[PDB]
């Protein structure tokens, strides 16, 4: 029996014991329309930029474990790949899809005296 399989079982067992104690010995009593509103687009952006950037980091992990054979030629393609995805992040930063500037006495009137008619 692999040490990794027994580890998974034991951690699961600990979780059941904690549930079991509080289900068996803790007290229990019967102590137990909705409006709606628009949601913030920033939440979609955080998940979107995370996912797309999470994929690009994943695609670089093979390079870090293959740097010796890749040498100069594989490094060029990795740098080309990094440069392309960096431009999309510049677009992310430049347009502030995360609302970087979300939170933020020149007078339009100047008067001149000319005197008596």
């Amino acid at each position: 029996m692999s040490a990794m399989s027994i580890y998974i079982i034991f951690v699961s067992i600990i979780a059941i014991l904690f549930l079991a104690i509080d289900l068996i010995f803790a007290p229990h009593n019967p102590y137990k329309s909705q409006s709606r509103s628009p949601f913030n687009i920033s939440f979609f952006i955080y998940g979107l930029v995370f996912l797309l950037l999470d994929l690009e980091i994943l695609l670089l992990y093979p390079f870090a474990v293959s740097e010796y054979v890749n040498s100069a030629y594989g490094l060029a393609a990795a740098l080309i790949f990094i440069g392309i995805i960096t431009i999309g992040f510049v677009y992310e930063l430049g347009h502030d899809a995360l609302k970087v500037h979300s939170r933020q006495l020149k007078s339009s009137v100047v008067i001149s005296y000319l005197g008596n008619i």
Partner: protein, 558 residues
Amino acid sequence: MIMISILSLLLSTSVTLRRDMSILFNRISIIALAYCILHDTMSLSFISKGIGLHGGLLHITNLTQIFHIFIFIISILILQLTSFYPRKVWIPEYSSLKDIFFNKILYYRTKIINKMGEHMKIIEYPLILLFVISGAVFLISTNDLVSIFLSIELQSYGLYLLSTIYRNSELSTTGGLIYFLLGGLSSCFILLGTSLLYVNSGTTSLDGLYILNSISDVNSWYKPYYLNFSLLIFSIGFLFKVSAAPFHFWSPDVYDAIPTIVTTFVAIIAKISIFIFLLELVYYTNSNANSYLSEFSWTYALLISSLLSLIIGTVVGLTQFRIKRLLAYSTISHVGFILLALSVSSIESTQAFIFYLIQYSISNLNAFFILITIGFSLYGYVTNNKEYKSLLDKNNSPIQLISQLKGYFYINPLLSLSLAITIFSFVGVPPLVGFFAKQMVLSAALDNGYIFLSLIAIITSVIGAVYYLNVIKEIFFYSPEHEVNPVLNESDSNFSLRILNEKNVLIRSVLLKGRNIFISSPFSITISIITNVILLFIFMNKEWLSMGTILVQILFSA
């Protein structure tokens, strides 16, 4: 070059938020695509069935390079819609070369030229436009199963984005949802077909698949049924993306809902890349010996779809009253002709295929250009029709109903004749280029024993002609419902224009009216060149038809 332009445009676009840059970015995209034509014109000085490039993942043919240039030219022409304002002010006192090139004119242009129209404020529109082009040209030059999948998603995902980029239109977001949802299902069938090829053959290389097909076409233990069956599943996904029947339901809805200028690009560019890609795959998988392979040939899905498109495209168009749904169904009938020529794999039909695709792309471009120009021309006209008032997205799709074209011959007779020429080219009336396109497909189908399909092609053509005639009847047989705007010409409603020299010093001052507001030159000239190519093709056919003849000879060269 397309990739440098995309990256360079994105960097310039990334650090700006100014929507008045949109027209300039569109013009730079025209300039960028002109360099792309130059680099591919440079590349045609060789004769070969194909040269695999970049580790064998891509390839180049004379055919591939010809249709890169065609895709670039169509994209430059379409990009004019977002690179020049729809209307201009013209006067005889500012018409000389010394005037246009040394003097300036001044007037309140904003309302006249629609400076702040939605189609002039989308910064990233030319950039998503170039992304679709990159997918289309990469698909043409694709030599590998994985390259196929990546290029088709690249082109497809960009088209979904373009259908939704007008994010404040309820119609456009609805159309974007429909294309993505049904388009995503179509992409599974392409990935499923490509995957089934790999799991059976052990290769992602199209070269190797052709070798496997060629040896297995002899006249036991690993009979290669997978190749036809996989390509059948693979082809079905590509039939959806060209809106071929019975996989065509999405396009009349998507084409009508998205704005007309967007429809122009979306409805044209995608068919060229898929059909050209299919052409080579049809050639190299076409069995010669009548064996068990040929009886299960995946290309019957193309012949069945051509039949079904010929009927659906013409019959269902009979009752359409909205002009963009009619064009969608008119397209379906024309891909029926295109698919017949692709299915007959003859030298004659491949010449017919190549000619039909180019002339239909040019002709369908003209119809959209004429339809957008008529929309931009009605600015100085008013109507009391109660139907027109109840239209949605009037700004995105100014012409939505065939009844809106009623009496357009009395509003602009020569522009109405250009529409009539284009529509008569769609029916196949000689000596228009559309006739010669249908004639070549029918002669090639007849010469290969496709008698039954040739007879249905002629019968559906008469049915299709009915709704084509119906558009023409509204333009010519009735007086218009649109009246010229009274306040534009009321003997006292005149706006001012200044003519100034190189030193910004006054030269003259002229008072102008609505009758001095004309269609912009880019749109009239593009309509005029294409209309005359359609009409005068019989005097100019030698080089155009010789190109395809030579292209097919290279492809077929034993």
